[PDB]
Amino acid sequence: RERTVRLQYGSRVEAVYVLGTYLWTDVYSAAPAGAQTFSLKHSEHVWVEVVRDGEAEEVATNGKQRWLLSPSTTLRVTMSQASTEASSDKVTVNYYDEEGSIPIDQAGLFLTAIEISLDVDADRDGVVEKNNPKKASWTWGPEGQGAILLVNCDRETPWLPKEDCRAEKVYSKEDLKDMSQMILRTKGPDRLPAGYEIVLYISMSDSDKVGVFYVENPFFGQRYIHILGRRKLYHVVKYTGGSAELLFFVEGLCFPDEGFSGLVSIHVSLLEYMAQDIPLTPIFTDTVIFRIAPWIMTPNILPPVSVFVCCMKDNYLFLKEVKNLVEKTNCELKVCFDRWIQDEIEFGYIEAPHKGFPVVLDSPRDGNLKDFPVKELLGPDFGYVTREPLFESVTSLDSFGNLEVSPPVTVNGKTYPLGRILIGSSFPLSGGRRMTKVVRDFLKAQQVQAPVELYSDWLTVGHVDEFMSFVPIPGTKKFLLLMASTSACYKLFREKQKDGHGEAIMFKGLGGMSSKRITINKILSNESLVQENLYFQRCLDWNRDILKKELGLTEQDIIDLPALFKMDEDHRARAFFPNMVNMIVLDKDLGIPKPFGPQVEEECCLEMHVRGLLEPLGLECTFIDDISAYHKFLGEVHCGTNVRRKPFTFKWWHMVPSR
Amino acid sequence: RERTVRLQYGSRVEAVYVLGTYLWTDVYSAAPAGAQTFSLKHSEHVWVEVVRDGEAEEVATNGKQRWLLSPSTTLRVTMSQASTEASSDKVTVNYYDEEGSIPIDQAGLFLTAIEISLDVDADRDGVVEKNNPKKASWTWGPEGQGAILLVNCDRETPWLPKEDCRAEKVYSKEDLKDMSQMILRTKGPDRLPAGYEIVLYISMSDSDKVGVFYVENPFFGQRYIHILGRRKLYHVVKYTGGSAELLFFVEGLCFPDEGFSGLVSIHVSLLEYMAQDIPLTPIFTDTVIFRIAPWIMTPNILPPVSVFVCCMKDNYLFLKEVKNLVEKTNCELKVCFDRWIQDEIEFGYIEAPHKGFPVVLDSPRDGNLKDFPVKELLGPDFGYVTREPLFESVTSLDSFGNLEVSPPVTVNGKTYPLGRILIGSSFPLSGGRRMTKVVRDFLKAQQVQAPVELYSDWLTVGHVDEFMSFVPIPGTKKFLLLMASTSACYKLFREKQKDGHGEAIMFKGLGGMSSKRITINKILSNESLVQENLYFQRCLDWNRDILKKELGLTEQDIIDLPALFKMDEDHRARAFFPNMVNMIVLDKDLGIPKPFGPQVEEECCLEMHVRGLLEPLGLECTFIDDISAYHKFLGEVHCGTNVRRKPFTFKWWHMVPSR
Ligand SMILES: [Ca+2]
Ligand SMILES: [Ca+2]
Ligand SMILES: [Ca+2]
Ligand SMILES: [Ca+2]
Ligand SMILES: [Ca+2]
Ligand SMILES: [Ca+2]
Ligand SMILES: [Ca+2]
Ligand SMILES: [Ca+2]
Incomplete structure (x- = not known):
């Protein structure tokens, strides 16, 4: 210069x-x-x-x-x-x-x-190098540089209930490990010449994105002085002679979002005094850039850590069968004594070179079923983030049964090393339901999962988790997409009827279903129900095509599981029997909702068919009965599970997203 | 697929x-x-x-x-x-x-x-090719593709006074040349099978960015049916058998801006009818992308076309001297019978492969000096655009004397083939004046001129045009930056004093200045005035450093012109004599404000000094007297000129801007 x-x-x-x-x-x-x-x-x-x-x-x-x-x-x-x-x-x-x-x-x-x-640590090894010439910009990829900042969205102690980033004060030391280090290094004589001072500052815009603290070591113990942040745009630095270092800790307050790229700037200037009433001249300015780490989801292929389950305390079969399934694995089971864990919560994570922790996204309150956020999972290294609409009404499509993510895929040469977020929607010209813009905008802004909208609005509940899922292929690095198929169910039932099994009864052991006496014959002879499910198969096939296109999948990557629906008064589908596709995936072990299908030689023909599809691949199937405690199935699922998984080993900052 | x-x-x-x-x-x-x-x-x-x-x-x-x-x-x-x-x-x-x-x-x-x-014409030759596989994206550069759209911001006829893009109706055919062609090409049998229809559509968001018309040729003459745009999100297309083409014309309504990248999408879908109350299924969808052309400014190095001048009808010397200067060139002179042409207007242009026209940016109204926009330049192939603040007060820094642009430069390896926009501001921590955000955001969003803020707030009026300008070096492809210099003025005056010229009088022939009897001696003996101008030189030097850094300039690229200021009650500078740097540049011919400096052997020593600097380079200097009609100089300029220039030959879409 x-x-x-x-x-x-x-x-x-x-x-x-x-x-x-x-x-x-x-x-x-x-x-x-x-x-x-x-x-x-x-x-x-x-x-x-x-x-x-x-x-x-x-x-x-x-x-x-x-x-x-x-x-x-x-x-x-x-x-x-x-x-x-x-x-x-x-x-x-x-x-x-x-x-x-x-x-x-x-x-x-x-x-x-x-x-x-x-x-700052621009080269992303966790240590602050001296004057990285690239510290003033931020680039993607393995050769990219620039410093990374976590939203400090966890909570160090329960005393003050809100997330740490919602306070301008540091009440605990461990909080410092969540932040990014920034060091002002100076070398010079005993004092600056008359008329100079050194000042740190940030823009008004960035002032709600960050906070910056200095840890003072005065007589009575360490303390953390908040020198930049909400309503603090600048800080006059005390100059120390010789070689001196001032250590600062930076926290993020905000995830990338609509209108916020994730990039923020911090400056230091040497200012020269001119006279009274004349602004000080910025003789020298040095700048560092931080990118705030995005919120990232975990596909079913990633290793499971914890299985979270919510049910009523008397659902014994469910609890026993889940406990046993988990015991085949190294996972921990956590139980709360009704679908909220599945619908209201999506476990994600954030990561920076110096650390990372899991972070819960909390589904928006509707003012009807949910009047309050679930913050009770907020804790040390377990973070929390939420988005609420301003004018927009929440619908069933805002539930996180409608929010999932694919395994890593390559599509037309482009790799998506973290997979692609999948959310259900309605056709553009339909006037149907869609996830709120505020949540959609948030997911899009994280960028590293490049979200894709599927068509879920043909379903009464309207969730992608109703019709599709992913499973690993054991012993390989590959995976399969599982799709609900009504055509598969009809083919199977027609075979069983031909086989002499037409009088086989659905829902054995649910006493609340007995008087309906539903048989294969009864189902196959219902003409309007056939027509409904042909239409539902067209809906499934429309999704199949979007998934193949946007995930780079072929027919070899897909297995169809039998399913059946009944149309409601809105021309939308509700499950006729439990949707087996929505399953607990713990590596090779699959917890599959028990279908209660027609019994042939005292085994459910749906269970046997699903085992015949999956077991040759080395997948182990356990059927989990969440409904018999209720004596009937109306198309509603009363239990929920959500699996917290290990993060991808691939670092998000090594990706190169589209412009 | x-x-x-x-x-x-x-x-x-x-x-x-x-x-x-x-x-x-x-x-x-x-x-x-x-x-x-x-x-x-x-x-x-x-x-x-x-x-x-x-x-x-x-x-x-x-x-x-x-x-x-x-x-x-x-x-x-x-x-x-x-x-x-x-x-x-x-x-x-x-x-x-x-x-x-x-x-x-x-x-x-x-x-x-x-x-x-x-x-659409994705390959950017002006003709619509069949099914460019790249038509669904937009990429920068000589090898880049995707279709370009002009904001149709001119006015075809004065009958309806607003810009064409502010109406949902086409009142004139010539308007079609401003738009971009889009052709729906189909081939098939006499009719579509039962249950299908073809529909064009756009998103709600994009509906205020564009409009789309079809030109019908019915019995009584050609007419333009508005099929997509404000409050029209979709259009059902009438199917024609055999090989058929439907020609549409697309207009842009909006420049790139804060929150709008410039990219818009248009879709066509083949829809299948299912039943009543069930949305139609999008069987096939085809998409085209348009990028709306940015507003682009012209540096002083570009060939002049028209010189616009405003003055009072009795300023004879000014008019005579400008007319004569222009007659040395091939330019046209346009006169209006007071600085508004310079302050309220910036001539830019827009361009697409099929056409381009000049476009005026109109400075925001302050509710004091300007209560009304200047729309009188709006006409055929002369466009208009403006930005007004919502809550923000307008200041002198919103005048377009404060808006200029550099010649093409290369900075640290990066080329800026269209130059870089320059606007004056105040230091970050100063609490000083700054151009309104709405205008700054607009300029930034055009992207291809990558704006740079300079420090103008040390000046009472506060405009970059007060202290710097650019001139070509004749016979070469190079240019110089000219900077106002108070140190140069003092050095010159000190030499003249030493030479025996101390009693030489400023402002000869301005009778309203005579009683002040200002001489070189009087100026040099004023101690406080020396101190003021030393400070002003520090302000100039701060800018010199920003310009060198952001424009990739060395000392070899800069010539200093003598200038002098007087400090006001706000500690801001006003010109002591006319600022010679703010000059009319018509290629090798320079109209330079007449300084009225001290006479030595009956020539102004400032004129002679400036000729000695510039003339060896082949620049021809004409001094233009805009003030003698007023009998005095108070630091205010009463006349204005603005030169409309030819656009760059380099196509903006051949640039590759930073992410
Ligand atoms: Ca480092
Ligand atoms: Ca923390
Ligand atoms: Ca922590
Ligand atoms: Ca989910
Ligand atoms: Ca073409
Ligand atoms: Ca027009
Ligand atoms: Ca025109
Ligand atoms: Ca200007």
Whole structure:
């Protein structure tokens, strides 16, 4: 950086020189009238070049050498080390008229060199390197750089109930591990020259995105001074001489969102005082950039950690069968004593090079079924985030049964290493339901999961989790998409009827269904029901095509599971028997809703068919009965499970998202 | 594109096949119970493959060949040409049980193949190519593609006073040349099969960004039907058989801005009717993208076309000297009978491959000096755009004396082929004036001029045009930055004093200045005035450094012109004599404000000094006296000029802007 510092007519100018810059110095404007030539002297630690029309020549500390005064002949002044002061650092210029060799005047420059660098971990190893030249920008990819910041959305202690980022005060030390370090490094003499001060600052816009603290170590214990953030745009820094470092901790307050890219800036400036009523001049400015880490979801293929379950305390079969399934795995089971864990919560995570933790997204309140957020999962290294609409009404499509994510896929050459978020919607011209804009905008803004809308609005409840899921193929790195299929169910029932099983009864053991006496015959002879399910198969097939296109899937990647629906008064589908596709996936072990299908030789023909599809792949199937405690099935699921998974090993900052 | 079309149990399914796709067909779900094998027949124009577990085999129009029924054995159905109908296009599947060779059932697929393509000029040559595969995205650069749209911001006829884009009706044909062509091309039989329709549509969000018209040629003359736009989100298209083209014209209503990237989408879908109360299914969708052309400014280096001048009718010297200067060039002079042409107007332009026109940006009204926009320049191929603040007060920094643009520059390897917009501001921590956000946001959103803020708030008026300008170097492709310099003025005056000229009088011939009797001596002996101008030189030097950094300039690229200011009660600068830097640049010819400096041998020493700087470069200087009609100079300029220039030859869409 070239900085302009010109000599002043018959005067000695004092300036602070910041290392990493250099000065160009006009000696011509300061020459007395009549002056012809000049000479110069300079101290040991100052490098001085005489530059005439672009060509430079170094000059000795004291030469008697004289040059022609001229506007195009200037000085270039460089220093490579900070002033000890001690430290006479100066350049002095003498002026001579035509006749006689004694100087007729003098102008001088007295310099104090200091180092000022605001440093962050831009190279993303968890340590703050000295003056990364790339610290002022942020680039994606394995070769990309720039510092990363977590939203500090967890809670260190229950005493103050809100997320840590909702306070301008730090009430606990462990909080510091969630933040990103920023160090102001300076080197110089005992004091700054008269008229200077160093100031940290942020823009008004960024002031609600971040907060910045300094940890003071005064007499009575460590304390955290909040120096930038909400309603603090600048902080005057106390200068310390010699080599000094000031450590700051930065917290994010906000996830990327509509109107906020995720990028924020912090600045330090050396300011020079001019006079009263005149603003201070920013002599030098150094900038660092942070990108706030996005909220990221976990597909079913990722290793399970915890299985969260909610049910009534008397659903014994459900609890026993889930407990047993989990015991086949290394997962922990957590139970709460009714679908809220599935519908109201999506477990995601955030990560930065220095740390990461899981973060819950909380579905919006409708003012009917949900009047209150679920914050009870908020805790140490378990974060919380939510979005609520302003004018928009919430519908069933805002439930997180309607929010899922694919395994990593490659589509037309483009890799999506974190998978793609999937949410259900209605056709553009339909006037149907859609997830609220506020939530859709939030998911889109995270960018690294590139969301895709599917068609869920043909279902009464309207959730993608009703019709599709993903499972790993054991012993490989591959996965399958599972799709509900009504055509598969009809084909199976028709075969069983042909086989002499037409009188086989659905719903065995649900006493509340017995008087209906539903048989394969009864189902197959219902003409309107056939027509309803042909239509529902068209709806499923429309989704199949979107999934194949947007996930880069072929028919080889898909298995169809038998399903059946009944149309409601809105021309929307509700499950006729439990939807087996919505299943608990713990690696090779699958908890599958028990269908209560027609019994043939005392086994459910739906269970046997599903085992015949999945078991050859090495998938182990356990059928879980959540409904027999209720004595009947109306199309509604009363129990819920949500699996918290390990994050992807692929770092999100190694992705390169579309512009 | 693979599309799912499955056979229906014991039924003949009718489907429209859109060319460019192909179908995968399940024959297994439609097989009767007990069926073992199947055979198939197909017509001439249908290609059918039997696919077992991913391996495909083509099958003859009628073979007697039988395959094992199985879920993993399916059909793949392809058509390469549209149905004439005429046209029996079908695939028929026969089912057989174990014992006996006569078919026990049949399922069939009756197909009507059509071509549907929505086409735009994506390759940017001005003609609409057939089905550019890149038409659904927009990329920058010489190899980039996607279609470009102009904001139709001019006015075809004065009858309806507003810009054309502010009406949902087309009142003149010439308007069509401003728009972009979009053609829906279809090929098929005489009619679509029962239950289908073709619909064009746009999103609600995009509905205020565009409008789309069809030109009907009915009995009484051509007319323009507005089929998409404000409060029209969709249009049902009338299908024509054979090969048909429907021509549409698209207009932009909005420039890129805060919250609007400039990109918009138009869709066509083939919809299938299901039943009453059930939304129509989008069987096929084709999408085109338009990017709306940005508003672009012109630096002083570009060829001049028209010089616009405003003054009082009695300023004779000004008019005579401007007229004469322009006569040295090929420019036209336009005069209006007071700085509004300079302050209230910035001439820009827009361009698309099919056409471009100049466009005026109109400075915001303050409710004091400007209560009304200047729309009188609005006309055929002269466009208009404006931005007004909502809650923000307008200040002097919103005048377009404060809005300029650099010549093309390269900075740290990055080329800015259109130059960089320059606007004056105040320091971040100063609490000073700044251009309104609404205007700043607009300029930033155009993206191709990557704006830079300079420091203008040390000036009373506060405009970058007060202290800096650019001139070409004649006979070369290079340019210089000119900077006001107070140090240069003092050096010159000190030399003249030494030379015996101290009693030389400023402002000769302005009788309203005579009693002040201002001389070189009087100026040089004023101590406080020296201090004021030393400070003003620091302000100029701060800008010099920003310009060098952000424009990639060295000292070799800069010439300093003498200037002098007087500090006001706000500690801000007003010109002591006319600022010579704010000059009319017509290629090698420069109209320079006449300074009225001290006379030495009956020539102004400021004029002679400026000629000595510029003339060796081949620049011709004409000094223009706008003030003698007023008899005095108070620091205010009463006349204004604005030069309308030819656009850059470099196409804006060939740039690659930062992410
Ligand atoms: Ca590091
Ligand atoms: Ca915390
Ligand atoms: Ca923590
Ligand atoms: Ca979910
Ligand atoms: Ca073309
Ligand atoms: Ca027009
Ligand atoms: Ca026009
Ligand atoms: Ca201007």
